Amino acid sequence: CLDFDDRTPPANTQFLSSHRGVYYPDDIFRSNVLHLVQDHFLPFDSNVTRFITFGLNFDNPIIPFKDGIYFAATEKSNVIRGWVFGSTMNNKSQSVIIMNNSTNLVIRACNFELCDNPFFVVLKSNNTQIPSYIFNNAFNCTFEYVSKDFNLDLGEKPGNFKDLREFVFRNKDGFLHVYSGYQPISAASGLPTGFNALKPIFKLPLGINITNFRTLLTAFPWGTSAAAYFVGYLKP
Amino acid sequence: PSKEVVRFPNITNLCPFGEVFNATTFPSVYAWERKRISNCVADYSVLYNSTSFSTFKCYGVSATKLNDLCFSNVYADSFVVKGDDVRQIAPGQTGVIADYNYKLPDDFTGCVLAWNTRNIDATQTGNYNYKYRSLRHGKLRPFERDISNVPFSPDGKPCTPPAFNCYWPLNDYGFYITNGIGYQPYRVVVLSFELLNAPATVCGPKLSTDLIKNQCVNFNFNGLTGTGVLTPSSKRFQPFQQFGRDVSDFTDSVRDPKTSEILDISPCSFGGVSVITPGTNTSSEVAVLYQ
Amino acid sequence: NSTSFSTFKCYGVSATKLNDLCFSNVYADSFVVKGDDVRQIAPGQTGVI
Amino acid sequence: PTKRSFIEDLLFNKVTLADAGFMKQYGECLGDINARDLICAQKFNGLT
Amino acid sequence: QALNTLVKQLSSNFGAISSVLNDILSRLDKVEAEVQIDRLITGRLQSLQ
Ligand SMILES: *[C@@H]1O[C@H](CO)[C@@H](O[C@@H]2O[C@H](CO)[C@@H](O[C@@H]3O[C@H](CO)[C@@H](O)[C@H](O[C@H]4O[C@H](CO)[C@@H](O)[C@H](O)[C@@H]4O)[C@@H]3O)[C@H](O)[C@H]2NC(C)=O)[C@H](O)[C@H]1NC(C)=O
Ligand SMILES: *[C@@H]1O[C@H](CO)[C@@H](O[C@@H]2O[C@H](CO)[C@@H](O[C@@H]3O[C@H](CO)[C@@H](O)[C@H](O)[C@@H]3O)[C@H](O)[C@H]2NC(C)=O)[C@H](O)[C@H]1NC(C)=O
Ligand SMILES: *[C@@H]1O[C@H](CO)[C@@H](O[C@@H]2O[C@H](CO)[C@@H](O)[C@H](O)[C@H]2NC(C)=O)[C@H](O)[C@H]1NC(C)=O
Ligand SMILES: *[C@@H]1O[C@H](CO)[C@@H](O[C@@H]2O[C@H](CO)[C@@H](O)[C@H](O)[C@H]2NC(C)=O)[C@H](O)[C@H]1NC(C)=O
Ligand SMILES: *[C@@H]1O[C@H](CO)[C@@H](O[C@@H]2O[C@H](CO)[C@@H](O)[C@H](O)[C@H]2NC(C)=O)[C@H](O)[C@H]1NC(C)=O
Ligand SMILES: *[C@@H]1O[C@H](CO)[C@@H](O[C@@H]2O[C@H](CO)[C@@H](O)[C@H](O)[C@H]2NC(C)=O)[C@H](O)[C@H]1NC(C)=O
Ligand SMILES: CCCCC/C=C\C/C=C\CCCCCCCC(=O)O
Ligand SMILES: CCCCC/C=C\C/C=C\CCCCCCCC(=O)O
Ligand SMILES: *[C@@H]1O[C@H](CO)[C@@H](O)[C@H](O)[C@H]1NC(C)=O
Ligand SMILES: *[C@@H]1O[C@H](CO)[C@@H](O)[C@H](O)[C@H]1NC(C)=O
Ligand SMILES: *[C@@H]1O[C@H](CO)[C@@H](O)[C@H](O)[C@H]1NC(C)=O
Ligand SMILES: *[C@@H]1O[C@H](CO)[C@@H](O)[C@H](O)[C@H]1NC(C)=O
């Protein structure tokens, strides 16, 4: 049970993607060959809606999920730590959440009582994470998965954005395909120009009419650090 | 060809055929479940002794070839329907079950099983423990679930159940012992898998052999048959790919299930030969020229 | 809501496309047969029925 | 060395033939596969 | 160029499930795979002609 009273209008800044956002189509090794494929890809030089924090803009809104999205987040500090996918985001329709809470990675899918304002609280005094509330009940369940243990640095960094992490999500035939990729970057604006291939990392067997998506942000106490994530829709 | 190089992964555990096909409780159609299958020796001969399937018909693969092939990404669904609704579980069908409860994809690589269970899922009085949806907006997408229980109205406005044009979308299956073949419980198990595309960890009992290299052999790598010469390679395979392909669709590189090591496959026949003859009338001797 | 059909299989059109298509000159026949004679109602079959 | 004159050698040097060696042995097409030579791919399919 | 085109024309599904054999023969029995084999043979013979 938490909420924010102070609000700031979303920026909703539109930028351009420099022909980035491709992924491996199939699990077949091919070398020294030019292959022609037809699938859902991000169009070259297309709009990307950016959402920016640390400017008193704790956005965390709902974004439509039409034929998949391309999630590219640039951040020098771990402010974005997962997503939540659902139809109505209430406790009347099943939703799947993926949170990068430390010492594991959690994927769970169940009739979740969303708090309407996801939260992840960590104080800058000791750089230690304290418990937060993303949901209040669980009700009926249908998936679960806990990964291995790792620790991500919560220490705040004063420098500009240091790493780029891009993901691609697609729901087809009851499977949520996830592709991951990461490349170093040093800039403070727009989306780095370049090329990068995304490798398959997940195929989650959950049957949900996934139509809306919302990210999970981390706040350093009202207010947070600098982190920008871009959303791009794929088209056939 | 001379020898056989059949090679299968290191699987030494029998598949769970009692957890499924012999589960104490089976879910309803409107809320079905899924189970992941891995590290199995899929021999359906063990089911010959206990379970008899009234309908075992499926697509994307031949029934007789299920013992040699190797499948990947195997999942098993389970639900309970009546006699007349057991024909709706098939690609390209219409009905209450095939629209609002469980829809199969148009293209489907898997197997569907179903048997009759009257002595277990029926009583002298009504069972009324299995439910299904009959009122819904639109149609379900293939392999999707809808477990929400909200009042349904033709207009779409939320409403209380006692109001007009407001019904509960879930009805109860009334199973009695004194019923015909129709309206009788039928437990259905649907299996889906993908083969010869990704690395696999589940298939039937085929005894692997040793590796034969630099010789025309009849290999069998995870169900992929053919004749060729196996040669050590230099390509580097990423951990999510197993086979390789050329500019023309043909497998040239296959990762060894056991002893991961990338092997090259080449055609056995290569070259050219011509025959020189002075004429049959003159002599029967010939001269052979190899290019 | 009312009737359950033990056999609903037919030809010349796809079952899933019956909601978008528009038919003309529709006629309906009706009769009563036994269980073993219900398979004889099909194009290219032999039997008493 | 060559039995051709200077002009004929110049003419032969201009044309960049695909250089079908007319003897592509099984050893050459079985090794050095990373080059992906077109001729080795054609002779594997019965085109000579 | 003609020979290279003929080589690269071997990866076309001439109405069959797959363009590469030993895959149709491994997933289907003798009777069912014969149709796809005949389709591939017809397509490749047309290419040769
Ligand atoms: C998964 O969730 C999605 C997203 O919510 C859902 O798809 C559709 O959601 C939209 C948005 O809520 C609905 O579409 C419209 O909704 C309103 C409210 O009814 C109306 O504008 C429309 O309904 C009327 O449409 C026609 C009138 O023009 C008439 O047929 C009649 O009057 C309808 O009331 C319209 O539906 C929509 O309700 C749902 N989809 C459906 C099929 O109803 C979807 O249900 C989920 N997807 C899956 C695959 O289960
Ligand atoms: C999804 O969650 C809902 C809500 O919890 C489940 O519905 C509820 O299921 C329980 C049993 O798990 C029902 O309790 C039992 O119901 C009847 C009498 O109504 C009787 O068998 C028992 O005395 C007991 O009370 C409960 O009524 C039912 N409804 C509500 C509103 O709570 C639902 O089953 C879950 N679905 C799945 C697929 O798990
Ligand atoms: C996002 O795409 C929209 C498409 O409407 C662009 O917004 C307008 O596009 C029209 C049509 O080309 C132009 O005439 C307007 O000038 C655009 N408005 C603005 C404010 O630029 C929009 O530019 C795109 N976003 C980008 C390119 O970042
Ligand atoms: C689904 O969520 C709603 C909204 O939170 C829950 O409604 C609550 O119902 C209880 C009584 O059951 C009331 O005391 C609360 O005030 C309600 N909350 C709100 C915000 O109005 C509803 O119970 C939930 N359904 C469940 C848990 O099955
Ligand atoms: C991150 O999430 C995991 C999964 O829920 C948490 O690990 C579990 O913690 C509970 C605490 O009651 C234990 O009962 C479980 O056995 C743990 N699961 C394991 C170890 O697999 C973990 O605590 C979370 N991290 C936090 C809260 O900092
Ligand atoms: C599958 O089992 C075989 C059994 O031979 C394994 O091969 C042995 O691997 C060990 C190391 O794990 C070596 O020391 C032996 O020399 C190998 N023996 C032979 C005959 O090759 C093989 O590694 C196993 N594969 C996997 C993936 O576990
Ligand atoms: C009498 C009016 C005839 C109108 C003809 C035009 C279209 C009719 C087509 C289909 C009607 C019957 C569909 C089968 C319903 C199956 C229900 C079930 O399987 O449970
Ligand atoms: C024993 C003599 C066998 C002779 C073989 C030559 C021809 C036989 C062919 C068909 C015989 C049986 C026809 C089926 C009759 C169906 C009657 C029904 O469906 O009601
Ligand atoms: C750091 O500060 C937090 C927050 O006050 C406190 O809980 C914790 O004990 C402190 N020490 C360490 C070692 O984390
Ligand atoms: C299958 O179920 C029957 C009861 O229906 C039980 O007696 C038998 O032991 C089971 N067989 C197994 C689990 O192999
Ligand atoms: C097969 O079933 C019979 C009874 O029909 C039983 O005695 C026997 O033990 C069973 N064998 C196996 C291998 O399950
Ligand atoms: C559907 O059938 C139920 C009983 O099963 C009945 O109460 C209801 O009125 C029927 N609805 C319609 C629209 O015919």
Coordinates of N, CA, C and O in Angstrom, one line a residue, chain B residues 214 229 231 234-235 245-248 252 264 266-272 291, chain D residues 22-27 29-30 33-34 36 39-41 43-46 48:
Chain B
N214 N 35.6 -40.6 -41.2 CA 36.3 -40.7 -42.5 C 35.9 -42.0 -43.2 O 36.7 -42.7 -43.7
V229 N 29.8 -38.8 -44.8 CA 31.2 -39.0 -44.2 C 31.4 -38.0 -43.1 O 31.3 -36.7 -43.4
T231 N 33.5 -35.9 -40.5 CA 34.9 -35.3 -40.4 C 34.9 -34.3 -39.3 O 33.9 -33.5 -39.1
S234 N 35.8 -27.2 -37.6 CA 36.4 -26.0 -36.9 C 35.3 -25.0 -36.6 O 35.7 -23.9 -36.0
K235 N 34.1 -25.1 -36.9 CA 33.0 -24.2 -36.6 C 32.8 -24.1 -35.1 O 32.9 -25.1 -34.4
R245 N 23.4 -25.5 -41.6 CA 22.8 -25.5 -42.9 C 23.7 -24.8 -43.9 O 24.5 -23.9 -43.4
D246 N 23.5 -25.0 -45.1 CA 24.3 -24.4 -46.2 C 23.5 -23.4 -47.0 O 22.4 -23.0 -46.6
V247 N 24.1 -22.9 -48.0 CA 23.4 -22.0 -48.9 C 22.2 -22.7 -49.6 O 21.2 -22.1 -49.9
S248 N 22.4 -24.0 -49.7 CA 21.3 -24.9 -50.1 C 20.9 -25.8 -48.9 O 21.8 -26.3 -48.2
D252 N 25.2 -29.8 -42.7 CA 26.6 -30.1 -42.9 C 27.3 -30.2 -41.5 O 28.4 -30.9 -41.5
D264 N 31.5 -32.4 -39.1 CA 31.2 -32.0 -40.5 C 30.6 -33.2 -41.2 O 31.1 -34.4 -41.0
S266 N 29.7 -34.6 -45.0 CA 29.9 -34.4 -46.4 C 29.3 -35.6 -47.3 O 29.2 -36.7 -46.8
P267 N 29.0 -35.3 -48.5 CA 28.4 -36.4 -49.4 C 29.4 -37.5 -49.6 O 30.6 -37.2 -49.7
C268 N 29.0 -38.7 -49.7 CA 29.9 -39.8 -50.0 C 30.4 -39.9 -51.4 O 31.6 -40.1 -51.7
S269 N 29.5 -39.6 -52.4 CA 29.8 -39.7 -53.8 C 30.3 -38.3 -54.3 O 29.8 -37.3 -53.9
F270 N 31.4 -38.4 -55.1 CA 32.0 -37.1 -55.6 C 33.0 -37.5 -56.7 O 33.8 -38.3 -56.6
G271 N 32.8 -36.7 -57.8 CA 33.7 -36.9 -59.0 C 33.0 -37.2 -60.3 O 31.8 -36.7 -60.4
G272 N 33.6 -37.8 -61.2 CA 33.0 -38.1 -62.5 C 33.8 -39.3 -63.2 O 35.0 -39.4 -63.0
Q291 N 37.5 -38.4 -63.6 CA 37.8 -37.0 -63.8 C 38.7 -36.5 -62.6 O 39.7 -35.8 -62.9
Chain D
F22 N 39.8 -28.6 -63.2 CA 39.5 -29.8 -63.9 C 40.0 -31.0 -63.2 O 39.7 -32.1 -63.6
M23 N 40.6 -30.8 -62.0 CA 41.0 -31.9 -61.1 C 40.8 -31.3 -59.7 O 41.7 -30.7 -59.1
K24 N 39.5 -31.4 -59.2 CA 39.2 -31.0 -57.8 C 39.0 -32.3 -57.1 O 37.9 -33.0 -57.2
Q25 N 40.0 -32.8 -56.4 CA 40.0 -34.1 -55.7 C 39.1 -34.0 -54.4 O 38.8 -33.0 -53.9
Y26 N 38.8 -35.2 -54.0 CA 38.0 -35.3 -52.7 C 38.7 -34.7 -51.5 O 38.0 -34.2 -50.6
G27 N 40.0 -34.8 -51.5 CA 40.8 -34.2 -50.4 C 40.6 -32.7 -50.3 O 40.6 -32.1 -49.2
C29 N 38.0 -30.8 -51.5 CA 36.6 -30.5 -51.1 C 36.2 -31.0 -49.7 O 35.2 -30.5 -49.2
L30 N 37.0 -31.9 -49.1 CA 36.7 -32.3 -47.8 C 37.4 -31.5 -46.7 O 37.0 -31.5 -45.6
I33 N 37.0 -26.4 -45.6 CA 35.6 -26.1 -45.9 C 35.2 -24.7 -45.6 O 34.2 -24.2 -46.1
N34 N 35.9 -24.1 -44.7 CA 35.6 -22.7 -44.3 C 35.7 -21.7 -45.5 O 35.0 -20.7 -45.4
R36 N 34.4 -22.2 -48.3 CA 33.1 -22.3 -49.0 C 33.2 -22.1 -50.5 O 32.5 -21.2 -51.1
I39 N 32.9 -24.1 -56.5 CA 33.1 -25.2 -57.3 C 32.9 -26.5 -56.5 O 32.3 -27.5 -57.0
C40 N 33.5 -26.5 -55.3 CA 33.3 -27.7 -54.4 C 31.8 -27.9 -54.1 O 31.4 -29.1 -53.9
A41 N 31.0 -26.9 -54.1 CA 29.6 -27.0 -53.8 C 28.9 -27.5 -55.1 O 27.9 -28.2 -54.9
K43 N 30.3 -29.5 -57.5 CA 30.7 -30.9 -57.8 C 30.1 -31.9 -56.8 O 30.0 -33.1 -57.1
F44 N 29.7 -31.4 -55.7 CA 29.0 -32.3 -54.7 C 27.6 -32.6 -55.2 O 27.0 -33.6 -54.7
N45 N 27.0 -31.8 -56.1 CA 25.6 -32.0 -56.6 C 25.6 -32.5 -58.0 O 24.5 -32.4 -58.6
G46 N 26.7 -33.1 -58.5 CA 26.7 -33.7 -59.8 C 26.9 -32.8 -60.9 O 26.7 -33.2 -62.1
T48 N 29.4 -30.9 -63.2 CA 30.8 -30.9 -63.5 C 31.0 -30.1 -64.8 O 30.1 -29.9 -65.6

